[PDB]
Design a binder for this molecule. Sequence first.
Ligand SMILES: CCCCCCCCCCCCCCCCCC(=O)O[C@@H](COC(=O)CCCCCCCCCCCCCCC)COP(=O)(O)OCC[N+](C)(C)C
Ligand SMILES: CCCCCCCCCCCC(=O)SCCNC(=O)CCNC(=O)[C@H](O)C(C)(C)COP(=O)(O)O
Lengths: 84, 73, 109, 51, 50, 615, 69, 487
Amino acid sequence: DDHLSREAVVDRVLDVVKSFPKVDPSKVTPEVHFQNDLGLDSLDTVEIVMAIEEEFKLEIPDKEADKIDSCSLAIEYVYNHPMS
Amino acid sequence: FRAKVWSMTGGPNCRPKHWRRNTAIAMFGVFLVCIPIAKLSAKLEQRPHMPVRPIPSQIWCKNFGTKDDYEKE
Amino acid sequence: AAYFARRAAQKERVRILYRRALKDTLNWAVHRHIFYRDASDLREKFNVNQDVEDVDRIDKLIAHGEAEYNKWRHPDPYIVPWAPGGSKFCRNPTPPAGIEIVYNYGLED
Amino acid sequence: GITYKGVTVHTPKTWHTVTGKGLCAVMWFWILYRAKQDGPVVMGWRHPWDG
Amino acid sequence: YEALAWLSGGLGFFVGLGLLAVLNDKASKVPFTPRVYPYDNLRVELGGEP
Amino acid sequence: MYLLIVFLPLLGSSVAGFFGRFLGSEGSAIMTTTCVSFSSILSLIAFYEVALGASACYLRIAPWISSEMFDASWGFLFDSLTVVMLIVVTFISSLVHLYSISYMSEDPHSPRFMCYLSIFTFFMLMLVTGDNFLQLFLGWEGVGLASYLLIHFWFTRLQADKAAIKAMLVNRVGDFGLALGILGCFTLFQTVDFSTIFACASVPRNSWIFCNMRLNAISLICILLFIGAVGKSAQIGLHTWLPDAMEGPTPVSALIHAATMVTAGVFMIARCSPLFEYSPTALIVITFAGAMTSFLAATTGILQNDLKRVIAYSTCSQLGYMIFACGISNYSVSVFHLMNHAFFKALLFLSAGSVIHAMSDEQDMRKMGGLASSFPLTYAMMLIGSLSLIGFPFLTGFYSKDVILELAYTKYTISGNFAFWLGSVSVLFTSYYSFRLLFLTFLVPTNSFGRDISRCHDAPIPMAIPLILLALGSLFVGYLAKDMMIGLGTNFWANSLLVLPKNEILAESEFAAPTIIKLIPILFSTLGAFVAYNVNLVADQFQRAFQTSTFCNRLYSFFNKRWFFDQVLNDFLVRSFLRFGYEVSFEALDKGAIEILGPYGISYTFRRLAERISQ
Amino acid sequence: GGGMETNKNKFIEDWGSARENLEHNFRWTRRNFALIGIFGIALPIIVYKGIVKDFHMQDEDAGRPHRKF
Amino acid sequence: YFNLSGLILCPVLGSIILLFIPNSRIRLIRLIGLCASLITFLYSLVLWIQFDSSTAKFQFVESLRWLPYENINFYLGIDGISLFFVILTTFLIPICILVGWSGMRSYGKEYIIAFLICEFLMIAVFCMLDLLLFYVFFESVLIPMFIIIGVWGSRQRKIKAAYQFFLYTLLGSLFMLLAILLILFQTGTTDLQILLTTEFSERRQIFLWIAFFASFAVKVPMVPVHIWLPEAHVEAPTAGSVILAGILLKFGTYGFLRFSIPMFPEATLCFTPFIYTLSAIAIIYTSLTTLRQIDLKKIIAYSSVAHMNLVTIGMFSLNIQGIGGSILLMLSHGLVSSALFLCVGVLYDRHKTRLVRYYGGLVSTMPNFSTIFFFFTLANMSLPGTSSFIGEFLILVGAFQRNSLVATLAALGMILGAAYSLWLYNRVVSGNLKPDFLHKFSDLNGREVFIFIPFLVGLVWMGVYPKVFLDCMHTSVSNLVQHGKFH
Ligand SMILES: CCCCCCCCCCCCCCCCCC(=O)O[C@@H](COC(=O)CCCCCCCCCCCCCCC)COP(=O)(O)OCC[N+](C)(C)C
Ligand SMILES: CCCCCCCCCCCC(=O)SCCNC(=O)CCNC(=O)[C@H](O)C(C)(C)COP(=O)(O)O
């Protein structure tokens, strides 16, 4: 029931894409999208979502689950969600 | 809004300051009214059988070994 | 055509069905040391075509994919307990925002 | 328990391990204790109680 | 409606295996004789007349 | 003194519920539990003075229904059979009360929980101590009422509401038979008491006139009583409720799902022993139903992947075994397995709750992996409980399962052989899914999330003492009770349990054993251990996931959806009832059909006849 | 927000005061005839015959001749 | 010397005093009306003290001439059965005054006039041995109930509700009146003691039994005629609607006990299967109709219909225990249904919706009302330990002893009773709370909390110890069962 703030979430969220081998862990940004800037395949978009779900216990509804095409949307979302 | 509703069985987290004092009264209340239940039962518990060994209930009871025959009920 | 509305639907369905397939793969693979290989197989299967351009060769493919996916469902899928369908959904929900209780009702004069 | 990259496990308390070990060892000994004294009862060989 | 088709088979196994216990006739395969008591199979202590 | 055994839990519940604001969330916790523990001590004293000092105690408070020759009284029957279940209910109830105070320290509505628990304790004490059918019927209905209240502990929870409602309806349809039974046995004896029908229960030999055709009298009464016990023992007829009953809190489930209300249906048969033995026809169908339910549950539990759901099917399998034990006139193993079960499944329930609420309230097999070394105490506890459950040789559970299977083999009746076969093949299933539970958790790589492992907290001390007591019990109680109560004619039961001379096969169940069948269920147990270990630890590359074409996914769905009972029964009975209660009774009977006599039926009739009469 | 009464939603008012008066709908249709003839004249007759048959069988067991009723 | 005359005079004095009281003095009107009602209740209770439950003949009788030749006359009295009905009638009315206490300013003094008029009217029904005047007061209750339903009805559709409740009653009333005329012309008098000792013709027995059944099957809701009760009962004020199911529903069912069973011994036996085949299918059809219902009032009325159809089975099953159980069930139902309609009316007096869709999650608030509602639902749920179960267990016992088939169908009623009442309880006061509709709401104050106290204490008292109720009337039931035959 600690409700961790942005300070402890900026690292955990970014580690998910840092561990991704297709994207080079040299220019990973808290505010970046993998479509163009990081150069990721259009299929692995939801794989990052599953990986971050395996870290924080929360499942976004599928209607806007893939609406998060940027790293910023995911981290603001997981902070917005209370039970994460 | 929980403070507005009475919640006769106690609120969700109802924690009175002197809850120990009330619990002492409540436990004392059970004991004092339990005695009439025990005292009124002493005129009951008819068991015609006689146990092979003495039990500790002979002091407050006498309804054992007396109701032998069944021709004058 | 030059209308991306149809293809955006395709790029939406592919991600949705991939997510659902990964979820079901996790459900079927109770142990995870098989889940890695199974997930790799699913990812590779989605890359089998990976080059569709014609609109006549997508509807049949999506229909076949949906039919094959629906054939195995793991009747007990994973739902988070506080999720809408879990084991503690509406466990102790937060009380409604605005509601008031009047005290002196039924008085006279 | 020492902390790792996600599993910051807490070691069980003193009485939540030694009590479990010293209570399970009782059952382990009791299995063989009943397999020695009353063990010959149900095996098909050497039926006890004057047999 | 397809569930009822599985329902018939599910209970059919129970009754089918129940009938198989009739086809072996374990009643006649007793390795001993029916139990007998003294005093007309304990007639006095089971009813009848003294 | 004997009244204090029953009335103290009721008094504690009443005072806690009425003054739950005067006492905090801990005052009621320390008060109701103390009262229940005092009642347990009283029950132990009664057991010492009755079970060993063999002299049953009898009493009568006041006449309840003082109509003509229908004497209903508030008396109780403190008999040798009854006091064993007094021990069973009181010890487990006090231990559950101690268990819940740790669990409910976070749940807000704490005092209401112990209030409900004490209501249940009082109701089942009234049931077991009862001596009249109708006065036992109040306990029978009160157990269901308390079950509904406790599963409905979460009024916000939508699933709990539907589960509670469906449980009430199915339990009502179940004990319909028993309710008919009270007045069925009354029309032949013109009495309802127990001591006046067990004295002369074999004399009637006439027939009746039922709805369709004339059948037997005693056999019909026993059939109705068994149908009543079906509702409270989750038999083949109506067992839709127990698998869905674990939608409420955990500490109650250790008391309502696997410990005590389990005993209601079997104790129905056990109490009225000299009524079923004179109805051989009812015994055979009882054996069929018990074996069928046991096998069905045993094969049901294996696919499910939840802590509480699978063990509910294990409880139902034990229900089937006990119903069969009560179906072959061998009620000794029935009560012995009851006493064992109330230990080694209540213990497992406490262990499951301890590992559930200490792991961020998750009850799953697919997601949670292995954390055995994180905490050895409650895993050692649950391992002991499981070893009892399989009945490892020379343990508490072995002394019941072995003897009950041997009794099943010995009786050569058409039901004895069939049900022995079913029990032998169900031993494999039970030893399979028990070890599946032992393996999919605590013996696999952890598949859970990285946040819950960090937030780890072992079982608190106050909730661990009940586990310690249950572990101490279900390791010595089997050995202590093997000789004294199933010992070829033990003289403590007296009139409590009566076995007819004809159907008494006990000595040749031990001295005529072929020794190739007595020790075979251990063989199925070890085979199940081997296959479960192979499938769930090493050989899982193809033996786990079956992505075939057809007939294998449907095999998965058939047992996951438990034979589509919740589908076929719902759609074909309750959906049809709800449809025809609106489109038949409210269409062609009252509203619309005969409403041609009320508004718009005759009102317009007199708007023409009366009009053309002035001119 | 000072109204103790309900808001009385429009879509619920029709649902409420429509089932209250079903005489207009349930006047003359094919399924109504089957339903009435199978559940208002059929079932009562069957259960009445069952009851009188039960009374007759009870009389026969006692031996007394059955009453005409 | 607390005779029956004063028990009827006291409400008359109360009404007469209220007539000449100015409308402005609203303080005095309610006080004096409640005092008169409570004095009547105590005067009824004191009769139970001096009841003398030993004699087969009738208790205190008052004879007042009505015709020049004393042919037929006002002949009061109770035997063993109408006593409890008189007590419960005298007890329900003060509850009616108390429930409609807060809003008396709009009601005026005319509200208490109708209630007290109906009060001594129903008092004069139960203790009325003369057969014809029993019909005069049996249909005299039309006017007070008509006025209560119409003048102070909740919604505007009350106009059509009252017409059915009136005309359905008049049809059967005059059908009974024809039979009364046939009996009087044949016998010569209508006094009950004599008329029970007259040899009738078997062909005449069936016709007169049918003629009585023409109306007595309307008061108790039967399969052909039960439409009036829901439509004319959901649309009545809570204080008034609580006696349509309280005392206005027990006339015909009790009328069977006093003017049908001992009156026509050879016809009830010949018509026994017909009553069985009506009531057994009623308990099923009405219960199924109850499930698919949305209004909060109608469900309770349908449950009441099912309970009356159940008690009808146990009444015509002539047994020493069947009739006693019928009376116990009728008293228990009079308590529980009254309590249930007050419970569902206190919700209406605050929110005015009468729809289960709006209601939901009323346990998170007003918990005392939730506890009371749960207790009264359990009482309607037919649990042992409450007065109801004592009520229908004897019904089942009496039915099964005679016919095996009817008992199973009757017990299907108490099986199906768990389908609608528990569903209503879980759908009204145990659902998810919605602030969209029930924006704000209070709990029970000191008035409705004290209203349920006599109901609760009487419920528990007659449930756990029904001995006194059975003790006071074993002689009368024995005399009623053994009539005409001599073996
Ligand atoms: C078979 C019938 C036997 C007699 C019937 C009585 C048996 C017990 C029946 C009542 C049990 C309690 C059910 C009460 C309703 C449950 C829902 C509810 O409304 O809860 C209320 C009422 O709570 C209670 O449970 C009060 C229980 C009082 C009942 C105690 C008496 C039971 C023993 C009497 C049995 C008779 C004894 C024999 C008599 C001779 C408040 O609970 P809270 O914890 O405050 O939660 C509400 C949320 N919020 C705080 C936000 C408002
Ligand atoms: C147990 C359940 C498991 C389910 C297994 C069965 C699932 C169905 C298998 C059979 C059907 C398939 O192969 S499903 C394979 C479906 N694959 C496609 O439709 C490719 C679409 N390609 C494009 O749109 C563009 O080339 C581009 C935007 C560049 C690509 O980016 P994205 O594609 O990212 O959008």
